[PDB]
């Protein structure tokens, strides 16, 4: 599923991401924007053989199991395919673990390089939340 900006903001909010670990909603939307273009089905292969999955491009190297990432952890206890669903529940639950991991939202490269330190409130402007 390709979400719209406000549809995603809503979805995230209902799932408890607004201000989760101090990250305003605008951050999560911005990060989804650049990581996956709001497409739940987004996959991307890394040079280390790991793959990134779903709206928040969660990495198989640590967080989910895809059966083809040797010596990887499955810290979220999910198959990676679960990250690609039209229901973002699993992607949100796993993201909450990731952001708690110590580096905050800096775990998301596109957040760091394109969202961080910007006016992220612009991502939710005009939405009915």
Q: Identify whether the C-beta of residue 55 lies closer than 8 Å to the C-beta of residue 43.
A: no
Q: Tell me which H or E stretch contains 5.
A: helix 5-14
Torsion of CA 79, 1, 23, 53, to 10 degrees: 30
Is 66 part of any known ligand binding site? no
Give CA 119 to chain center in angstroms: 19
Rg over CA atoms, the chain? 14
Three-state SS at 20? strand
Q: Which residues are catalytic?
A: 35, 52
- Start-to-end CA distance of the chain, whole Å, equals 20
Annotated binding-site residues for substrate read 101
Annotated binding-site residues read 101
């Amino acid at each position: 599923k390709v979400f719209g900006r406000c549809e995603l903001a809503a979805a995230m909010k209902r799932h408890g991401l607004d201000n989760y670990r101090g990250y305003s909603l605008g951050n999560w939307v911005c990060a989804a924007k650049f990581e996956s273009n709001f497409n739940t089905q987004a996959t991307n292969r890394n040079t280390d053989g790991s793959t990134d999955y779903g709206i928040l491009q969660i990495n198989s190297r640590w967080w989910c199991n895809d059966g083809r990432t040797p010596g990887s952890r499955n810290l979220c206890n999910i198959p990676c395919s679960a990250l690609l669903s039209s229901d973002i529940t699993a992607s949100v639950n796993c993201a909450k673990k990731i952001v708690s991991d110590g580096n905050g939202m800096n775990a998301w490269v596109a957040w760091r390089n394109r969202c961080k330190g910007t006016d992220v409130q612009a991502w939710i402007r005009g939405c009915r939340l």
